[PDB]
Amino acid sequence: ASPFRLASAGEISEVQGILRTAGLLGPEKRIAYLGVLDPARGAGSEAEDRRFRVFIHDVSGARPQEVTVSVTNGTVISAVELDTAATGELPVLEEEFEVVEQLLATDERWLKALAARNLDVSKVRVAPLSAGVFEYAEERGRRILRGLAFVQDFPEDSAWAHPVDGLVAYVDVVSKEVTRVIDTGVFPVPAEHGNYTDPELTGPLRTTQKPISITQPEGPSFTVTGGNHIEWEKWSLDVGFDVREGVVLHNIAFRDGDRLRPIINRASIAEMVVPYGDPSPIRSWQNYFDTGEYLVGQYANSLELGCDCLGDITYLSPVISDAFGNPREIRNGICMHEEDWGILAKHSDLWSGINYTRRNRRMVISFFTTIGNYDYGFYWYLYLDGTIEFEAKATGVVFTSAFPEGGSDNISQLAPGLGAPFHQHIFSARLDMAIDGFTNRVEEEDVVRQTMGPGNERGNAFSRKRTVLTRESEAVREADARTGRTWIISNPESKNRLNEPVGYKLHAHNQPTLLADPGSSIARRAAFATKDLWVTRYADDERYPTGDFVNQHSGGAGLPSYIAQDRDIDGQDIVVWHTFGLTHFPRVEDWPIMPVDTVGFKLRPEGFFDRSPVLDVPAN
Amino acid sequence: ASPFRLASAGEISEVQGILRTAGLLGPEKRIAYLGVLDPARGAGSEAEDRRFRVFIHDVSGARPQEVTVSVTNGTVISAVELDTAATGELPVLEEEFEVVEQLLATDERWLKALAARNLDVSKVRVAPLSAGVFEYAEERGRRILRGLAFVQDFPEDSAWAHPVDGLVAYVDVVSKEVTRVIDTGVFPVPAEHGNYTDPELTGPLRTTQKPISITQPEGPSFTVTGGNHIEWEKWSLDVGFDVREGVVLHNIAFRDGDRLRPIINRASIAEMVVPYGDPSPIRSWQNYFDTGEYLVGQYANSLELGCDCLGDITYLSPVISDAFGNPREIRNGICMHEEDWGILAKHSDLWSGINYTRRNRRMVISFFTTIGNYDYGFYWYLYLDGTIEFEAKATGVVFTSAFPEGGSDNISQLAPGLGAPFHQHIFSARLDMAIDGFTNRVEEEDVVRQTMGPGNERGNAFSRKRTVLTRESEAVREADARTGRTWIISNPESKNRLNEPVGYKLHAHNQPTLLADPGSSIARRAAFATKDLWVTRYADDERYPTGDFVNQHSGGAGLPSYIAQDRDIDGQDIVVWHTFGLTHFPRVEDWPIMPVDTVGFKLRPEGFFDRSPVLDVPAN
Ligand SMILES: [Cu+2]
Ligand SMILES: [Cu+2]
Question: Which end of chain B is more exposed for a tag (fewer CB within 10 A), N or C?
Answer without folding.
Answer: N
